[PDB]
Amino acid sequence: KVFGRCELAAAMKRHGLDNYRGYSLGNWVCAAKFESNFNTQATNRNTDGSTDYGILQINSRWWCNDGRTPGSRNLCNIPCSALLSSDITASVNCAKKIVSDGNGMNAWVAWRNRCKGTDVQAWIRGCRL
Ligand SMILES: [Cl-]
Ligand SMILES: [Cl-]
Ligand SMILES: [Cl-]
Ligand SMILES: [Cl-]
Ligand SMILES: [Cl-]
Ligand SMILES: [Cl-]
Ligand code: NA
């Protein structure tokens, strides 16, 4: 599913991501834009042989099981395919665990390089939230 910007903002807000660990909704929308272009089906292979899955590009090295990332963990206790669903519940639940890990949203490289310290409020402009 390719979400619209405000559709995704509303879904993230409903599932409790707005101000989760102190990160306003625009941070999460910005991260999704640059990680996945709002496409739940996005997958990208990493150099180390892990893969990133879904709207927030969650890595099989630590967070989900894809059966092909040797020596990896499954800390969200989910198949990585669950992170590709049209329903973002699994991705949001796992992202809450990731952002609680101690480095906040720096876990998302595209957030750190493209969203951090920018006007992230712009990402929820016009949305009826
Ligand atoms: Cl914001
Ligand atoms: Cl497996
Ligand atoms: Cl594996
Ligand atoms: Cl959803
Ligand atoms: Cl933080
Ligand atoms: Cl500034
Ligand atoms: Na894994």
UniProtKB/Swiss-Prot annotation:
Keyword Metal-binding applies: no
InterPro entries: Glyco_hydro_22 (IPR001916), Glyco_hydro_22_CS (IPR019799), Glyco_hydro_22_lys (IPR000974), Lysozyme-like_dom_sf (IPR023346)
Domain C-type lysozyme span(s) in chain numbering: 1-129
SMART domains per UniProt: LYZ1
GO molecular-function terms, A-Z: beta-N-acetylglucosaminidase activity; identical protein binding; lysozyme activity
Binding annotation for substrate: D101
EC primary class: hydrolase
Catalyzed reactions per annotation: Hydrolysis of (1->4)-beta-linkages between N-acetylmuramic acid and N-acetyl-D-glucosamine residues in a peptidoglycan and between N-acetyl-D-glucosamine residues in chitodextrins
Superkingdom as given in the UniProt entry: Eukaryota
Disulfide bond sites: C6-C127, C30-C115, C64-C80, C76-C94
Tissues/organs with expression: In the egg white and polymorphonuclear leukocytes.
EC number: 3.2.1.17
Subcellular location: Secreted
SUPFAM superfamilies: Lysozyme-like
Family: Belongs to the glycosyl hydrolase 22 family.
Function of the molecule: Lysozymes have primarily a bacteriolytic function; those in tissues and body fluids are associated with the monocyte-macrophage system and enhance the activity of immunoagents. Has bacteriolytic activity against M.luteus.
Subunit structure: Monomer.
Protein name per the record: Lysozyme C
GO CC annotation, single: extracellular space
Key words, A-Z: Allergen, Antimicrobial, Bacteriolytic enzyme, Disulfide bond, Glycosidase, Hydrolase, Secreted, Signal
Lineage, opening ranks: Eukaryota, Metazoa, Chordata, Craniata, Vertebrata
Misc. remarks from the entry: Lysozyme C is capable of both hydrolysis and transglycosylation; it also shows a slight esterase activity. It acts rapidly on both peptide-substituted and unsubstituted peptidoglycan, and slowly on chitin oligosaccharides.
Keyword set includes Disulfide bond: yes
GO biological process, one term: defense response to Gram-positive bacterium
Catalytic center residues: E35, D52
